[PDB]
Structures are given as structure tokens and as C-alpha cells.
Design an enzyme around this catalytic site. Structure first.
Site, PDB file in Angstrom:
ATOM      1  CE  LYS A 155      55.859  41.098  -4.544  1.00 16.86           C
ATOM      2  NZ  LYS A 155      54.475  40.345  -4.132  1.00 16.86           N
ATOM      3  CG  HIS A 216      56.892  61.955   2.468  1.00 14.45           C
ATOM      4  ND1 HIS A 216      56.590  62.491   3.854  1.00 14.45           N
ATOM      5  CD2 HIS A 216      56.517  60.840   2.555  1.00 14.45           C
ATOM      6  CE1 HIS A 216      56.150  61.407   4.618  1.00 14.45           C
ATOM      7  NE2 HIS A 216      55.953  60.433   3.774  1.00 14.45           N
ATOM      8  CB  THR A 266      48.708  62.653   1.664  1.00 14.55           C
ATOM      9  OG1 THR A 266      47.636  62.936   2.820  1.00 14.55           O
ATOM     10  CG2 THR A 266      49.627  63.623   2.193  1.00 14.55           C
ATOM     11  CE  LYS A 269      52.373  61.434   4.698  1.00 15.73           C
ATOM     12  NZ  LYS A 269      51.909  61.071   6.068  1.00 15.73           N
TER      13      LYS A 269
HETATM   14  C1  LIG Z   1      60.004  43.030   8.502  1.00 16.86           C
HETATM   15  C2  LIG Z   1      60.164  43.205   6.923  1.00 16.86           C
HETATM   16  C3  LIG Z   1      61.259  42.650   6.560  1.00 16.86           C
HETATM   17  C4  LIG Z   1      58.711  42.721   6.251  1.00 16.86           C
HETATM   18  O1  LIG Z   1      58.110  41.536   6.952  1.00 16.86           O
HETATM   19  P1  LIG Z   1      58.528  40.227   6.158  1.00 16.86           P
HETATM   20  O2  LIG Z   1      59.857  39.909   5.765  1.00 16.86           O
HETATM   21  O3  LIG Z   1      57.771  39.044   6.756  1.00 16.86           O
HETATM   22  O4  LIG Z   1      57.544  40.368   4.818  1.00 16.86           O
HETATM   23  P2  LIG Z   1      57.812  40.005   3.320  1.00 16.86           P
HETATM   24  O5  LIG Z   1      58.488  38.812   3.185  1.00 16.86           O
HETATM   25  O6  LIG Z   1      58.175  41.309   2.521  1.00 16.86           O
HETATM   26  O7  LIG Z   1      56.079  39.954   2.792  1.00 16.86           O
HETATM   27  C5  LIG Z   1      55.303  40.880   2.747  1.00 16.86           C
HETATM   28  C6  LIG Z   1      55.230  41.219   1.084  1.00 16.86           C
HETATM   29  O8  LIG Z   1      55.885  42.564   0.843  1.00 16.86           O
HETATM   30  C7  LIG Z   1      56.373  42.325  -0.490  1.00 16.86           C
HETATM   31  N1  LIG Z   1      57.379  43.408  -0.568  1.00 16.86           N
HETATM   32  C8  LIG Z   1      58.436  44.195   0.125  1.00 16.86           C
HETATM   33  N2  LIG Z   1      58.927  45.032  -0.307  1.00 16.86           N
HETATM   34  C9  LIG Z   1      58.100  45.542  -1.353  1.00 16.86           C
HETATM   35  C10 LIG Z   1      58.363  46.360  -2.563  1.00 16.86           C
HETATM   36  N3  LIG Z   1      59.174  47.598  -2.464  1.00 16.86           N
HETATM   37  N4  LIG Z   1      57.399  46.408  -3.552  1.00 16.86           N
HETATM   38  C11 LIG Z   1      56.572  45.454  -3.459  1.00 16.86           C
HETATM   39  N5  LIG Z   1      56.208  44.240  -2.586  1.00 16.86           N
HETATM   40  C12 LIG Z   1      57.267  44.532  -1.715  1.00 16.86           C
HETATM   41  C13 LIG Z   1      57.049  40.915  -0.488  1.00 16.86           C
HETATM   42  O9  LIG Z   1      57.330  40.732  -1.843  1.00 16.86           O
HETATM   43  C14 LIG Z   1      56.207  40.437   0.064  1.00 16.86           C
HETATM   44  O10 LIG Z   1      55.231  39.852  -0.792  1.00 16.86           O
HETATM   45  P3  LIG Z   1      55.229  38.272  -1.131  1.00 16.86           P
HETATM   46  O11 LIG Z   1      54.259  37.612   0.173  1.00 16.86           O
HETATM   47  O12 LIG Z   1      54.378  37.955  -2.327  1.00 16.86           O
HETATM   48  O13 LIG Z   1      56.760  37.841  -1.334  1.00 16.86           O
HETATM   49  C15 LIG Z   1      60.313  44.612   6.816  1.00 16.86           C
HETATM   50  O14 LIG Z   1      61.616  45.143   7.137  1.00 16.86           O
HETATM   51  C16 LIG Z   1      59.949  45.573   5.512  1.00 16.86           C
HETATM   52  O15 LIG Z   1      59.048  46.641   5.759  1.00 16.86           O
HETATM   53  N6  LIG Z   1      60.008  45.057   4.345  1.00 16.86           N
HETATM   54  C17 LIG Z   1      59.854  45.571   3.219  1.00 16.86           C
HETATM   55  C18 LIG Z   1      60.637  46.486   2.500  1.00 16.86           C
HETATM   56  C19 LIG Z   1      60.975  47.806   2.946  1.00 16.86           C
HETATM   57  O16 LIG Z   1      62.091  48.239   3.275  1.00 16.86           O
HETATM   58  N7  LIG Z   1      59.999  48.643   3.082  1.00 16.86           N
HETATM   59  C20 LIG Z   1      59.926  50.175   3.574  1.00 16.86           C
HETATM   60  C21 LIG Z   1      59.273  50.045   4.736  1.00 16.86           C
HETATM   61  S1  LIG Z   1      58.948  52.112   5.189  1.00 16.86           S
HETATM   62  C22 LIG Z   1      57.564  52.899   5.298  1.00 16.86           C
HETATM   63  O17 LIG Z   1      56.365  52.359   5.018  1.00 16.86           O
HETATM   64  C23 LIG Z   1      57.828  54.380   4.719  1.00 16.86           C
HETATM   65  C24 LIG Z   1      58.452  54.496   3.238  1.00 16.86           C
HETATM   66  C25 LIG Z   1      58.477  55.850   2.628  1.00 16.86           C
HETATM   67  O18 LIG Z   1      57.698  56.768   2.988  1.00 16.86           O
HETATM   68  O19 LIG Z   1      59.421  55.851   1.798  1.00 16.86           O
HETATM   69  C1  LIG Z   2      54.864  57.968   1.182  1.00 16.86           C
HETATM   70  C2  LIG Z   2      53.544  57.649   1.429  1.00 16.86           C
HETATM   71  N1  LIG Z   2      52.578  57.294   0.652  1.00 16.86           N
HETATM   72  C3  LIG Z   2      51.244  57.305   1.235  1.00 16.86           C
HETATM   73  C4  LIG Z   2      51.075  57.444   2.696  1.00 16.86           C
HETATM   74  C5  LIG Z   2      49.419  57.414   3.115  1.00 16.86           C
HETATM   75  O1  LIG Z   2      48.871  58.631   3.258  1.00 16.86           O
HETATM   76  P1  LIG Z   2      47.536  59.042   4.143  1.00 16.86           P
HETATM   77  O2  LIG Z   2      48.015  59.507   5.228  1.00 16.86           O
HETATM   78  O3  LIG Z   2      46.554  60.333   3.601  1.00 16.86           O
HETATM   79  O4  LIG Z   2      46.809  57.747   4.109  1.00 16.86           O
HETATM   80  C6  LIG Z   2      52.199  57.873   3.513  1.00 16.86           C
HETATM   81  C7  LIG Z   2      51.667  58.383   4.970  1.00 16.86           C
HETATM   82  O5  LIG Z   2      52.439  58.470   5.627  1.00 16.86           O
HETATM   83  C8  LIG Z   2      53.251  58.284   2.831  1.00 16.86           C
HETATM   84  O6  LIG Z   2      54.223  58.493   3.720  1.00 16.86           O
END
Ligand SMILES: CC(C)(COP(=O)(O)OP(=O)(O)OC[C@H]1O[C@@H](n2cnc3c(N)ncnc32)[C@H](O)[C@@H]1OP(=O)(O)O)[C@@H](O)C(=O)NCCC(=O)NCCSC(=O)CCC(=O)O
Ligand SMILES: Cc1ncc(COP(=O)(O)O)c(C=O)c1O
Ligand SMILES: Cc1ncc(COP(=O)(O)O)c(C=O)c1O
Ligand SMILES: [Mg+2]
Lengths: 468, 480
Positions: A155, A216, A266, A269
């Protein structure tokens, strides 16, 4: 002697408390007869809900409630089985057909949730193509991250919406290498949007599959609420309605929605129920259906819940007033905040993220809003968003008429004053953040359409397997 | 010339067709006003459903339907959020409290499904203890297999219910190594049962956590339908009812249900709705709630579906007639098949697996039953069961009265004749299989004894009827 399991759990919990990401849940009981009010612990304490993802308020729509009530009388509560044994039925067939019709795809497959849908599809792609390389947007949802981990392949994470970086990663592999580009149409935490058209172009060039989460967006974008992919060819889709357009918006053969290989959404929503789905080709759908363990080995959703979703989807398809209404309510709040110098993270979508910039102050704001003003807005903190960019998420709906909006605006203004929160001009003086202090998907022309401007045809085998 | 994605899918599908594991679904529309009938494509074509996991017929129970209708009028359809944002509510609080009360645990946590519950809990245990060794029963459900894979730690698969092999594996590690024993109470494909008591003893000795999937037991075993773990101390639990017993059935300090660390169940079978849960200590529950991504980042189940499940759980808790009724209906079918030499895989549970031994013939039987006789029974094939042991799954309920049973018995007999399927005597001549036609196989006695089967609702503690079930602080998070 034995490993100290209790001690490990104690300290894992205590870690969440000290960094203050330990979440307390809110008792919020939404009233279907009084959208968008809800009561707390006691029925007497009511509040206005401003952070629900029931984006079109279809959870309480008469056609949805009627479909549920009538389906319960006939079918009962549970499906009483899986799709393979005793849990395959007409409400299922109708829901999958509706979802396929909406995205004008050959088929659609329903899962417990979009979380499950994402995990199932991404898992399977990586398990059956070990050579696959997945290109994932930085800000993808937890479900996609988990699905990509479970895929168990190579990835690359490209910086948010940076299609230069994407192209650089894509280029460094031969064309023959299988690839997946996984992204969302609308990202929920500040309301940014993907350039789906350009990503499909990249996918054509470097020989990749596209995977698009429109969670969304469905209900909200396009003339029929089919999502941002539909909106990309708004006029072509509006002209043809239910049917496949003869051309896209540039006179080409295929629409953006047609070119995306896999679209997930989904039912929980905009569509006011619960569940998830993917829409795709007959072949892809049959594949997931036949091999995805998270599809096969779980109880089918209640018939009534599917009927509810189906009614929500049928209704919104031919009621563009839902979208124009919501867009107008959003613009109204955004514009009012702008005049009061309440800092909104700019975005071209339906979300209204109010920047606070401090975890404690955002939580404190959230609390004063619900306790003093009976406004339920949720504070968004690390790790959902970067530390220092904490915010209140506000999501208007067709039901948030201007009277309710006015109360919110006044309340938020009061709280900003009470806690001496930074206004736009205070952010300007610190050089700006995320657009605050240094072009909508819905145009003026689109926003002035009515239901009369839709095609009449939007009013009124793979789900079961194919014989050989 | 990029990768040929269509050709990979084409040949993966074609592989499933040639080995004849490609599944066609049946359009089956269950009628709540005529349990256990259903209609097919047209409402006129009705059939009797004999393979549903709506084991107590609570999917159509008045208290369940009423709870749904009334909850919809107040709350609508969707919860409209996750547990963190706008999707935490009273129907949720009540459902979790009921589930904790049922298994007499400190807490319970509700997920989209038991599949998700299993995947979440197993995933988290392995992710937070990288040194963990998981001991998994051979015949564990797909969800547990996936959860153990996702746990991403060392695993050993012990032969089905072979607690010698389990002890040998457990022994070969020091005691201090963290360990998990993961198994089911009732296995659905032939209805075998685990010796939960002996597994808990092993776990005590070698310092392991226990993970018990009671999916095919909740509703069905124990005086209150709390599962096989409850049944293990049937009399202790029946005497105390809602409350924790002062002693177990041998006069000891702790019940088998108390000793199991983590119990998972479904709301989508006996409880006539949809969803899954785990019941455990306050600490474990708060842990899963705070860290499990499959819990956190998904829309909460509809309030109405939770209300439905809650009513199903409250009702069956104090209605042991559901269990005695079902047990009697099962025994009736089993005994009739025994007399006709229709090969039933022996088991001490509520399932009636009819052995066919050929994939084609089982599918063919399934089809003649539904088309000629209006009986819906599903054929079970590879990979759900070992090739050569294919079977028809039959699951009687309180609603399958003897009139319906008679028609089934006659129909199955007719089909056995039509297709010249092997009878018990024909299995005897091939050495026996899974107990069928195996001289000097000694069957395990039914979990439900004669004494237990003759209990009525008047033999339950009054405190299990309409109990006031206080909500749980851990469902919302804990202050201190
Ligand atoms: C605390 C952290 C930093 C995450 O905790 P950690 O730093 O301990 O985790 P990490 O090092 O990322 O380890 C978890 C695994 O996630 C993976 N990972 C992170 N971002 C990724 C992405 N965009 N696509 C694929 N894999 C991804 C890393 O490569 C890692 O896999 P490996 O172990 O193989 O290295 C948080 O900030 C976070 O959420 N980070 C992820 C990036 C992000 O911004 N996500 C959006 C969250 S918001 C949400 O859910 C709503 C989103 C929406 O609706 O748009
Ligand atoms: C961008 C996005 N994908 C997937 C999901 C998961 O959908 P469900 O609530 O049907 O499990 C969510 C839920 O908040 C989301 O915000
Ligand atoms: C033993 C066992 N556990 C778990 C499940 C999955 O539970 P749910 O239907 O709640 O996803 C099943 C379904 O086949 C099962 O048989
Ligand atoms: Mg059929």
C-alpha cells in the site's frame, strides 16, 4: 504465575484517560414527530440536534415509517437466517435493485453496514490478488484503513487529494501490475471533495481499479442523489433520468459514474436506516457474493429495515427539493457565521466545521451549547483530526429551517463570546489555518431546479445467483 | 496491456461452478401471521420453513412486534449516528443491560452482528497482546477464523472437542505466556457440544482466557436461555433466577458462566432480530468499547431493532415453555427418523442434521422437498462441511407442532425413496459416519433431561418475570 490480563487492560484504558480521548456517550433520543429535536435522559429535557448524519431527515419520513410498519406486519422483525439459508427475500431484492438503479450499475450487494462492505471488498481484492498495490488517500475512513490492512498487500498513502503524488506512485510500477485506487468522494471532517474524473483518468492510464466511498455524498449530490460521481455529469444524468446517458457532460461515451469500478455507500445516513452496499458490474457483485465471508456468514438485515431504506432511496431519487433545501440551509448558516466572524473551515459541500483550535475549549463549547442552549453539536478531537485543529461539526438538513438556524447562530455567537474563542480575524492575524483567515459543488443554476425539472421516468439475477 | 481483472474474476467464478459450490439463493418470504410458513416469488406459492434459525419463533412474537411499532413511532427508523455521535440512546442502554443480566455479567456491548463482535474482540486481543497464543477448535465459525487471522498472533487448531490435544498444546508453553481458548458452546452443523467446564479447568491450569461463542445456545439452553454455560449449573441458576447463585451445582464457589471471560451471542437467531454482543467484566467491555474500530466507526443499529431484541430476551427469560416445547418437537422428529432409518447425525442438542453424503443428491433432495412437497430445508455442502458428509439441516421450533412434523417426516421419507438415498443400515455397512450406523458409538445424552423438560414457567424464580433492569454506566463510559 499467569499473565496479568487485568493490569494490561487497566493501563490501556488509563492511557486514553490521560490523553483525554476517553469518550463519554450522550443519551440522545431522536423524536420522529419533532425533527430535529431529541430528548436526553428525561423526556422533558429536549435539545435540537445539529450533528446527525440523517442528512435528509428521511429517518422519520412518512413513506419510510409506513414501509417499516407494513413490512413488520407481514414479515416480522428478524429475517431469521443468512442469504444462503432462509434469509433471502423480496425486500432484499428490491433494495439491491434500487441501489443498482441509483448508480446505474449492473448490480449491487447489501451488507450489514458500509464498514463491513468496505472491509469485505478491500479484504477480498488483496486476498485474491497478492500482487496488488493499493493507493489510499491519507484521510480515508477507518473502515477503508482496516480493509486495506486486511487486504494484506503493498500500500501507498498519498497526501490528501494530491493527484501529483498519486501519479508519481502509479508511474513507478509497470502497467501490468494490478492496482487499486481507494478514496472517498466527500470527506466528512472538513468537507473536502475528490476529483473523481481525474482519478479515473489516472486509473485508465496506469491500469488500476477504482474504489469510491460515497458515504457522505449519496442523497446529497447529483440530480438524483447518486453522489458526486453523478454530479460530475449532472446535466447528462438529469436529462436521461433513470436511463444511462447517451453521452457524458463533455460529449464523450462514458460517464464518471459508469467508469468507477466499485462504489460503496451506507443506508445509515441520508437513507435513514442501517446497512451498507457496493454497486458494480454483475461480475464483481457475483464475486463478492460468492467469496466474501463478511457477506456469507451473518444474519441478513431485518426486512423492515431494508423496506425503510428502499422507500428513502425511491423518494429522494425524484425529490431534488431535498438537496436544494439542504444546500440552502447550509449556505444560510455558513453566511451567517461569516458575518459574525465565526470561523468556518471553507469547503464546497454540506458540512459546517467550526474551528476552535483547542480540544478543551471545543469540548467546553459543546457542553455549554447543550446545557445552556439545548443545541447538540459534537466536538471533533484527536485522533479524528490533527491536534490544534479541533472543531464543532454542524450538519444542516432540509428540516433545519431558518428559524432553527437563527437559534443556532445566536447560540454559537453567545458561546464564542462566553469562552472568548477566536473569531475569523484572530485567525487571520496568526497567518490563517485550513483556509480560515486565509467553489460549491452545487451551482446557482443547479440550486434553482425543482422536481419539475427531473425526467418523468424517475417517478415510480446476481442478487440470487446466475444459472450455469 | 494492463492486468486482466475480468479474466481473474471469470475463472474464480467458473471454479466454483465446476466444483458445484456455487450457491443459488431461494426467494423465501416468511409470514409473521402464519409461522412457520413462507411464500416464494408469488404470494400464492407457500412452503413450510424447516431450516430457519428463528429457533423460538420470536421474530413474530407480539411483544417483539409491538416494541418495534411503538419504538418506530417515537424514534423513527435509523439511529442517525454512531455511539460517539448522536447514536447513543435508551433502547441501546436497555438492550445492553438485558444482555448483561442474562449472562449475569458486569457488562455487555452490542455490535452490528455477532460476526463483527467476534472479529472485533479476537482482533483486539491479538493486537494488544502480540505474544498471545490462540487455541482454536477445528470447527469454529468463519467469524472466529477471520478474527483469529486478524489477531495476527500464534495459533494452534485442536481437533474437534479433543481436550487431550488441547491440554498437550497448552502444556508446551510456560504458564506466564498469555493464551486464549476460543470455542463454541453448540456447533451448528452437526449439533455437537463443548465441555465448557473442563475447558475452564484447563484455562485455570495453564493461565488462559476463555472466549465462548454461544450463538446456537442463547434462548435454548439453561432455565432462562442464557446458554450451555447456564445449563451447566441449571439448578443453581433456576433457584436464584436473576441473581448470582450462592454456589454452583457441585456446591463450589463459582458457576461455569461466571468463570468464562468472554461470551458472544447473536440477536439474529433465537432473539428474532439482528445484531451481536459480548458479555464480560466491566473492564473488558470498556476496553472493547474504547478501542474496537468495528464498534466505534459504524452507524448504531435502529432503535426499533434493539427494542425488538430486548423484548425477545425479556420474554424468553421467564418462558421456559419455549425451550421444553422446542426440545420435545426436536426429539419427536429425531425419533420418527430413527424408526424410518433416516440417518440423523446424533447430537444432544436441538439440531436435526440429515446425512446424505453426496453434494448433488443433497441439493437434489433440497429441491424436490421445496418443489414437490413445499418443505424448505437447506442442503449443506463443502466448504461448510467436509466433502462426503453433505446434509440437510432441520431446526424445529415451538411452532413446529406434530402435525407439521408428520408431513415433514413423510416428505423426507418419500424423497429418500425417490432418490434411493442411503438409510441408516446402508451407513452401518460403510462403517458408520459421525455416529450414524456406528455400533458401539455411545451417544451423549441430551443436554435437556427428563426432569428439566417437565418444568413449567411456575418452576422459575418470580424475579425473572418483568424485572426492573437498571442501565449500565459502562455503556456510556465511567466517571471515577
Ligand atoms: C493516532 C493516529 C496517528 C493513528 O494512530 P497510529 O499512528 O498509532 O497508527 P498508524 O501508524 O497509522 O498504524 C495504523 C495503520 O494505519 C495505516 N494508515 C493510516 N492512514 C492510512 C490511509 N490513508 N490508507 C491506508 N492505511 C493508512 C498505517 O499505514 C498503519 O498501517 P501499518 O501498520 O502497515 O504502517 C491518527 O491520527 C490517525 O487516524 N491516523 C490515520 C490517518 C488519518 O488522518 N485518518 C483519518 C481519521 S478520520 C475518520 O475516520 C473519518 C474520515 C472521513 O470520513 O473522511
Ligand atoms: C466515509 C465513511 N465510510 C464508511 C462509513 C461506515 O458506514 P456504516 O455506518 O454504514 O458502517 C462511514 C461512517 O461514518 C463513513 O463516514
Ligand atoms: C457459531 C456462529 N457464530 C456467529 C455467527 C454470526 O452471527 P451474526 O448472524 O449475528 O453475524 C454464526 C452464523 O452462522 C454462527 O453460526
Ligand atoms: Mg427460488
Amino acid at each position: 504465575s499467569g499473565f496479568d490480563y487485568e493490569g494490561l487492560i487497566d493501563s490501556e484504558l488509563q492511557k486514553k484517560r490521560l490523553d483525554k480521548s476517553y469518550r463519554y456517550f450522550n443519551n440522545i433520543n431522536r423524536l420522529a414527530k419533532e425533527f430535529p429535536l431529541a430528548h436526553r435522559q428525561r423526556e422533558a429535557d429536549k435539545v435540537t440536534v445539529w450533528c446527525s448524519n440523517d442528512y435528509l431527515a428521511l429517518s422519520k419520513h412518512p413513506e419510510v415509517l409506513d414501509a417499516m410498519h407494513k413490512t413488520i406486519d407481514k414479515y416480522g422483525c428478524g429475517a431469521g437466517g443468512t442469504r444462503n439459508i432462509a434469509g433471502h427475500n423480496i425486500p432484499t431484492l428490491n433494495l439491491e435493485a434500487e441501489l443498482a438503479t441509483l448508480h446505474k450499475k449492473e448490480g449491487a450487494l447489501v451488507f450489514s453496514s458500509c464498514y463491513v462492505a468496505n472491509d469485505a471488498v478491500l479484504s477480498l481484492l488483496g486476498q485474491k490478488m497478492k500482487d496488488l498495490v493499493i493507493f489510499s488517500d491519507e484521510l480515508n475512513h477507518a473502515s477503508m484503513i482496516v480493509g486495506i490492512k486486511h487486504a494484506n498487500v503493498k500500500k501507498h498513502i498519498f497526501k490528501h487529494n494530491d493527484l501529483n503524488e498519486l501519479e508519481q506512485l502509479l508511474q513507478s510500477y509497470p502497467k501490468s501490475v494490478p492496482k487499486l485506487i481507494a478514496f472517498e468522494s466527500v470527506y466528512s471532517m472538513a468537507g473536502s471533495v475528490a476529483d473523481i474524473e481525474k482519478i479515473c483518468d489516472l486509473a485508465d492510464k496506469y491500469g488500476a481499479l477504482t474504489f469510491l466511498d460515497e458515504v457522505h455524498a449519496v442523497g446529497l449530490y447529483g440530480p438524483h442523489g447518486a453522489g458526486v460521481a453523478e454530479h460530475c455529469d449532472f446535466e447528462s444524468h438529469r436529462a436521461s433520468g433513470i436511463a444511462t446517458p447517451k453521452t457524458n457532460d463533455k460529449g464523450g461515451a462514458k460517464t464518471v459514474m459508469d467508469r468507477v469500478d466499485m462504489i460503496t455507500g451506507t443506508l445509515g445516513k441520508s437513507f435513514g436506516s442501517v446497512g451498507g452496499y457496493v454497486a458494480a458490474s454483475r461480475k464483481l457483485i457475483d464475486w463478492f457474493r460468492s467469496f466474501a465471508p463478511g457477506f456469507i456468514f451473518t444474519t441478513t438485515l431485518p426486512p423492515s429495515v431494508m423496506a425503510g431504506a428502499t422507500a428513502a432511496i425511491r423518494y429522494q431519487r425524484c425529490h431534488i427539493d431535498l438537496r436544494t433545501s439542504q444546500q440552502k440551509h447550509t449556505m444560510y448558516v455558513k453566511k451567517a457565521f461569516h458575518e459574525l466572524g465565526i470561523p468556518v473551515i471553507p469547503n464546497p459541500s454540506h458540512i459546517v466545521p467550526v474551528l476552535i483550535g483547542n480540544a478543551d475549549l471545543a469540548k467546553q463549547a459543546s457542553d455549554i451549547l447543550i446545557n445552556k442552549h439545548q443545541i447538540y453539536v459534537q466536538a471533533i478531537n484527536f485522533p479524528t483530526v490533527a491536534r490544534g485543529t479541533e472543531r464543532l461539526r454542524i450538519t444542516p438538513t432540509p428540516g433545519h429551517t431558518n428559524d432553527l438556524s437563527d437559534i443556532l447562530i445566536n447560540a454559537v455567537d453567545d458561546v464564542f463570546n462566553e469562552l472568548q474563542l477566536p473569531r475569523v480575524r484572530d485567525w487571520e492575524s496568526q497567518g490563517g489555518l485550513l483556509g480560515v483567515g486565509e467553489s460549491n459543488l452545487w451551482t446557482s443554476s443547479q440550486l434553482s431546479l425543482t422536481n419539475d425539472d427531473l425526467n418523468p421516468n424517475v417517478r415510480d439475477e446476481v442478487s440470487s445467483g446466475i444459472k450455469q
